[PDB]
């Protein structure tokens, strides 16, 4: 479709991305740890 600028709803969707990837890492890190506990008892 100028001085277009971005607002806080754009930067929330950008900040949401960052928090989602970090929780994804954290959730994988918990999955790894659950399975390592199983291997330990073995």
């Amino acid at each position: 479709d100028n001085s277009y600028s971005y607002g806080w709803s754009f930067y929330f969707g950008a900040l949401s991305f960052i928090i989602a990837e970090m929780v994804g890492v954290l959730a994988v890190h918990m999955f790894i740890d659950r399975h390592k506990q199983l291997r330990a008892t073995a």
Binding site: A14, F17, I18, E21
Partner: protein, 49 residues
């Protein structure tokens, strides 16, 4: 009308806004790519990682 002999000489000439210093910015190395690409390289680097 009548005129005396001239008291001052002149010719038509051109006036311009002499110069334009344009001191380049400190963070000007990032001009080639727009601000969106840069922010989107940081987002496409966190995803890839």
């Amino acid at each position: 009308i009548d005129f005396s002999k001239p008291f001052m000489s002149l010719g038509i000439s051109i006036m311009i806004k002499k110069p334009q210093k344009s001191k380049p910015g400190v963070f000007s190395f990032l001009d080639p790519l727009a601000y969106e690409i840069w922010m989107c390289i940081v987002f496409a680097y966190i995803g890839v990682s």
